[PDB]
Amino acid sequence: VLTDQNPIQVVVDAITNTGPREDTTRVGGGGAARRQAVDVSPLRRVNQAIALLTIGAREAAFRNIKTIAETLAEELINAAKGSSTSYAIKKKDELERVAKSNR
Amino acid sequence: IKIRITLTSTKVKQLENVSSNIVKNAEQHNLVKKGPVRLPTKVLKISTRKTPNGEGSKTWETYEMRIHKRYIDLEAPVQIVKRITQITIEPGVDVEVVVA
Amino acid sequence: AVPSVQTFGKKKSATAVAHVKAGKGLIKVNGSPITLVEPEILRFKVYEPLLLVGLDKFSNIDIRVRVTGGGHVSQVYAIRQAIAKGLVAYHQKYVDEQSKNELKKAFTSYDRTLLIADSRRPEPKKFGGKGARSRFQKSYR
Amino acid sequence: ENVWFSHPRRYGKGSRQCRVCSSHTGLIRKYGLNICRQCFREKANDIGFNKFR
Amino acid sequence: KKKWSKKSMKDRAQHAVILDQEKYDRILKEVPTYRYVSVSVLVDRLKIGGSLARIALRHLEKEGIIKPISKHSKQAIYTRAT
Amino acid sequence: GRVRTKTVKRASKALIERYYPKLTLDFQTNKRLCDEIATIQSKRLRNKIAGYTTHLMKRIQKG
Amino acid sequence: PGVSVRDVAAQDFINAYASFLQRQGKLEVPGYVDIVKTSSGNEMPPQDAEGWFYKRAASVARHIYMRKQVGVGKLNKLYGGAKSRGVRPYKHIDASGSINRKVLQALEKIGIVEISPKGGRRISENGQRDLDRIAAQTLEEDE
Amino acid sequence: SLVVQEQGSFQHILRLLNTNVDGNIKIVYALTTIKGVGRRYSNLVCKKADVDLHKRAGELTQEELERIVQIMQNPTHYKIPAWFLNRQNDITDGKDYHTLANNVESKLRDDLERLKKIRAHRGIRHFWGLRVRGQHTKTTGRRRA
RNA sequence: UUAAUUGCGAUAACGAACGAGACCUUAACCUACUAAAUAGUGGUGCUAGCAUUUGCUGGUUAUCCACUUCUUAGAGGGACUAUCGGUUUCAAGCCGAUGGAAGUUUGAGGCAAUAACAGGUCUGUGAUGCCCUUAGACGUUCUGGGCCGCACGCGCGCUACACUGACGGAGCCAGCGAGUCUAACCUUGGCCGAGAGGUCUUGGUAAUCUUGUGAAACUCCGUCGUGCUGGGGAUAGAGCAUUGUAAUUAUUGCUCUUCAACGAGGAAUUCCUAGUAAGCGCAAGUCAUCAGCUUGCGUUGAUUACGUCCCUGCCCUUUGUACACAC
Structure with a gap:
């Protein structure tokens, strides 16, 4: 009913935008374990996008009057169009920022 | 008359050979008969701790006793009814006679 | 002799017996139409085969499904597998074997599980745990 | 002594007791064999219960 | 034990259960141009009570501008029919 | 878990x-002759024996 | 061609039966309705005072029509639910035997449902006729 | 919507049956806010008074308030089956009495001091501030201060 | 190389034995050899709703025909990696695709290596050895108190922070599980209550009776609706009761109330590879009476696992040792 373009298309655009492409892995380092900036995972990209959208929708839908359906729909549209406000996309870009910082 | 032989044993081999010899003698005697109706096998389970005292891992064991019950319903003269009932008697298998 | 074929769809415990015969072209479950069980979701799920194959193949065929066992999803899955197998048996026994083959090809192309019954039978539970593989808790002190 | 056994023991652990060792603890009422679990472990093979799983 | 808090004032919403003409005309002139309408929409974009929002939704739909897409409980969706 | 036990192989x-x-070289005829050409205490053991027998016939058929 | 409560949706048909029975008002209500909670597990009584007894009667009568022979214990088991037993975990609890028995008696009095042999109760001829008439009214009103 | 004058009839906190009640909720749950009577008795009283539940708690008539007053004064005079009440076959007389917000606490204190005076095990437990209903106190009831 | 001293193989070893496998059950696919008024179809013995249109839903035995291709059965059939590619001193093996039940020994269990704990159990014994008591004894007549006193700390768990929820109404789905003979087991009722209980046996020596165990988050119309609320019966006082010759320091169930914690819950710590995690429910065990426990089953169902030893442990080999009650 909103965003009258293709609904699966906006869904997939949100998935790609929220899918993190640089992450951090625990490197032993020696005593002080560090983070290592690792690129490359398409399956993990889509997996993390789905997980991020779901947990953001449920965090929005916890303890409030708006129902999980409209919270999830708003999160999907916000992530698809790009607003730097949705919880999934903020977490993804913050993880990206720390990954590039410790890169 | 509608007599009935029902057998409620535990040893499947003796159960099956009792049934087989009964049906084979009936077939060779050329009577009218109903097939052996074979009730579901009833398994008695007892679940108990292996240990006598309470020490060790909480490990359990299940002792199972299997009971096989079959029955056959016949109509015949009294003399041959008693003949069929009293021949082919085997230890371990318990059989009894009912009506209708 | 009214030509009826007996198939059955299976699940964890849901058994659905399907009687498919030459009639007026109806589908009924427990004497009530498949179209009017009103789940609003499982209705479409059981429509799936009928929607994908069209009404060309149910001109004068009556299919009666008697269900017993399992939850709602298990029952509808048993229903769909039984009705698919019943239509397959009808189109093999009476309609052309070529028609049966092409019907099964379309069913497989839409989904491979349409033809194959699920066999993920429940795993028995062992002592020392609440479930099949889960243990209770390992407290040391 | 008429009062030596005046108090009834019609139920509880006074009624149920092991029929091989007079042990009041661990009895298996199931199937009416009335044998404590520790003795049933020993005698099950000849009693009829057999171990499969 | 410990209260695990600071004991400060919360949101303390003033969800309207009764209104007047000054808010009725505002909601009447606002219910257009609303692509998606529900109880949450009414409450958050109107700052009105849940019961009043539900009553307004029922009355507006009984008159008829918006049409429903889902009648499922806990989630009602209404879109204005152009 | 495909490694055969020494008894099956021998x-x-x-x-x-x-x-x-x-x-x-056919498994079905191999088993349908093996059941009478060798005395085995298990249908599954017969299946394993005949399967490995077929594998060795395939091995000899090329070298 | 062919009207039957199985062929009709359940909720709308039972609502129609409730409205029809409410219009007629000749069921000989027990009189202590509006004070009972329809069960023993509910923590809050029902909502409508003069209502819900037509609903319970329609439901029981339709359930009897589906089934063959059913007694008060079966009614209670059927209408029971999980009860919030505080900290102890939820358990199934039956419905109210008194209300199930009294709605059976009311159906008996109105002739919708009658005693049957071998123990139990069966949907009566006129009760079945009225039920199918209400269902057919539903098919005529919706279509 | 329905227009009611912005008079003193709307107050942020009001008095009802010697307690304080905030409106903007259902009348039945406002009655539940009264100490000693809860949702069950409130809904029973409203339903037997035949006042519509879907109606709000804004307009209530003087005859209706007197109706509720008379119901609470003489519930048996209003054909109530006498097992909904919270004091069955009282020790003083044996009649059925329905408590008020103050009456319930006074009655509770009266039976508490009665148990203490009679020096039962229950009275001793209530004096000592322990669990009396036979609960397991070896690991529970620590933060009793 | 997967789980394997599992095998292929080189070789002072050859030939063996025990463990692993092999084996025995469990759940899966059988339109076959043989099936009963316990799961049905058409005429019928009797009858109703959509009508004189061909059917469904109903309700019953002796009045019969065709079948267990759904419950269960017994000489019993297949599945062994079958086939087709890629990879190798061109040797065992691994990785991908088909009717079909899945190609991680199909998944899961049972007993389980001449080795040892100075682990538990002398509270399971008319199994004793060594000491305790040897006619006011630990054998035993009756009354009671007690893992129910806590100042306190630690564990399997159950209910919860609720609008993916609580409640009210219409649907409402498993079987392996249990059952009176020297005097009762689970329950089918004419009457009363959301409750237990009486008159007779429809249930019996039991797939036919309880029981399709009509048992739960599961499908729809609303109320509560973010405000510490309707999630707490924690806690405490009023009445009915099955059991017990005593349920009083709620054994247990049902009618009524206060509001004390709860804004991703700190150091730490436990389980989870295909229907397992988890959620919810059912049956047996202990029982004179009640499950928050255990053993089994049923409903929905899991992203990161065919990877690695970084932590905790292992197995083999080499190695060092001042260790050998063995770090």
Whole structure:
């Protein structure tokens, strides 16, 4: 009913935008374990996008009057169009920022 | 008359050979008969701790006793009814006679 | 002799017996139409085969499904597998074997599980745990 | 002594007791064999219960 | 034990259960141009009570501008029919 | 978990050494002759023996 | 061609039966309705005072029509539910035997449902006729 | 919507049956806010008074308030089956009495001091501030201060 | 190389034995050899709703025909990686695709290596050895108190922070599980209550009776609706009761109330590879009476696992040792 373009298309655009492409892995380092900036995972990209959208929708839908359906729909549209406000996309870009910082 | 032989044993081999010899003698005697109706096998389970005292891992064991019950319903003269009932008697298998 | 074929769809415990015969072209479950069980979701799920194959193949065929066992999803899955197998048996026994083959090809192309019954039978539970593989808790002190 | 056994023991652990060792603890009422679990472990093979799983 | 808090004032919403003409005309002139309408929409974009929002939704739909897409409980969706 | 036990391997080899021409490369006929050409206490064990027997016939058929 | 409560949706048909029975008002209500909670597990009584007894009667009568022979214990088991037993975990609890028995008696009095042999109760001829008439009214009103 | 004058009839906190009640909720749950009577008795009283539940708690008539007053004064005079009440076959007389917000606490204190005076095990437990209903106190009831 | 001293193989070893496998059950696919008024179809013995249109839903035995292709059965059939590619001193093996039940020994269990704990159990014994008591004894007549006193700390768990929820109404789905003979087991009722209980046996020596165990988050119309609320019966006082010759320091169930914690819950710590995690429910065990426990089953169902030893442990080999009650 909103965003009258293709609904699966906006869904997939949100998935790609929220899918993190640089992450951090625990490197032993020696005593002080560090983070290592690792690129490359398409399956993990889509997996993390789905997980991020779901947990953001449920965090929005916890303890409030708006129902999980409209919270999830708003999160999907916000992530698809790009607003730097949705919880999934903020977490993804913050993880990206720390990954590039410790890169 | 509608007599009935029902057998409620535990040893499947003796159960099956009792049934087989009964049906084979009936077939060779050329009577009218109903097939052996074979009730579901009833398994008695007892679940108990292996240990006598309470020490060790909480490990359990299940002792199972299997009971096989079959029955056959016949109509015949009294003399041959008693003949069929009293021949082919085997230890371990318990059989009894009912009506209708 | 009214030509009826007996198939059955299976699940964890849901058994659905399907009687498919030459009639007026109806589908009924427990004497009530498949179209009017009103789940609003499982209705479409059981429509799936009928929607994908069209009404060309149910001109004068009556299919009666008697269900017993399992939850709602298990029952509808048993229903769909039984009705698919019943239509397959009808189109093999009476309609052309070529028609049966092409019907099964379309069913497989839409989904491979349409033809194959699920066999993920429940795993028995062992002592020392609440479930099949889960243990209770390992407290040391 | 008429009062030596005046108090009834019609139920509880006074009624149920092991029929091989007079042990009041661990009895298996199931199937009416009335044998404590520790003795049933020993005698099950000849009693009829057999171990499969 | 410990209260695990600071004991400060919360949101303390003033969800309207009764209104007047000054808010009725505002909601009447606002219910257009609303692509998606529900109880949450009414409450958050109107700052009105849940019961009043539900009553307004029922009355507006009984008159008829918006049409429903889902009648499922806990989630009602209404879109204005152009 | 495809490694055969020494009993299966040795029984298959013994079958091959003394009945090479009597049996062929098909599993179904191999088992349907093995059940009577060797006494085994398990249908599954017969299946394993005949499967390895077929594998060795395939091995000999090329080298 | 062919009207039957199985062929009709359940909720709308039972609502129609409730409205029809409410219009007629000749069921000989027990009189202590509006004070009972329809069960023993509910923590809050029902909502409508003069209502819900037509609903319970329609439901029981339709359930009897589906089934063959059913007694008060079966009614209670059927209408029971999980009860919030505080900290102890939820358990199934039956419905109210008194209300199930009294709605059976009311159906008996109105002739919708009658005693049957071998123990139990069966949907009566006129009760079945009225039920199918209400269902057919539903098919005529919706279509 | 329905227009009611912005008079003193709307107050942020009001008095009802010697307690304080905030409106903007259902009348039945406002009655539940009264100490000693809860949702069950409130809904029973409203339903037997035949006042519509879907109606709000804004307009209530003087005859209706007197109706509720008379119901609470003489519930048996209003044909109530006498097992909904919270004091069955009282020790003083044996009649059925329905408590008020103050009456319930006074009655509770009266039976508490009665148990203490009679020096039962229950009275001793209530004096000592322990669990009396036979609960397991070896690991529970620590933060009793 | 997967789980394997599992095998292929080189070789002072050859030939063996025990463990692993092999084996025995469990759940899966059988339109077959043989099936009963316990799961049905058409005429019928009797009858109703959509009508004189061909059917469904109903309700019953002796009045019969065709079958267990759904419950269960017994000489019993297949599945062994079958086939087709890629990879190798061109040797065992691994990785991908088909009717079909899945190609991680199909998944899961049972007993389980001449080795040892100075682990538990002398509270399971008319199994004793060594000491305790040897006619006011630990054998035993009756009354009671007690893992129910806590100042306190630690564990399997159950209910919860609720609008993916609580409640009210219409649907409402498993079987392996249990059952009176020297005097009762689970329950089918004419009457009363959301409750237990009486008159007779429809249930019996039991797939036919309880029981399709009509048992739960599961499908729809609303109320509560973010405000510490309707999630707490924690806690405490009023009445009915099955059991017990005593349920009083709620054994247990049902009618009524206060509001004390709860804004991703700190150091730490436990389980989870295909229907397992988890959620919810059912049956047996202990029982004179009640499950928050255990053993089994049923409903929905899991992203990161065919990877690695970084932590905790292992197995083999080499190695060092001042260790050998063995770090």
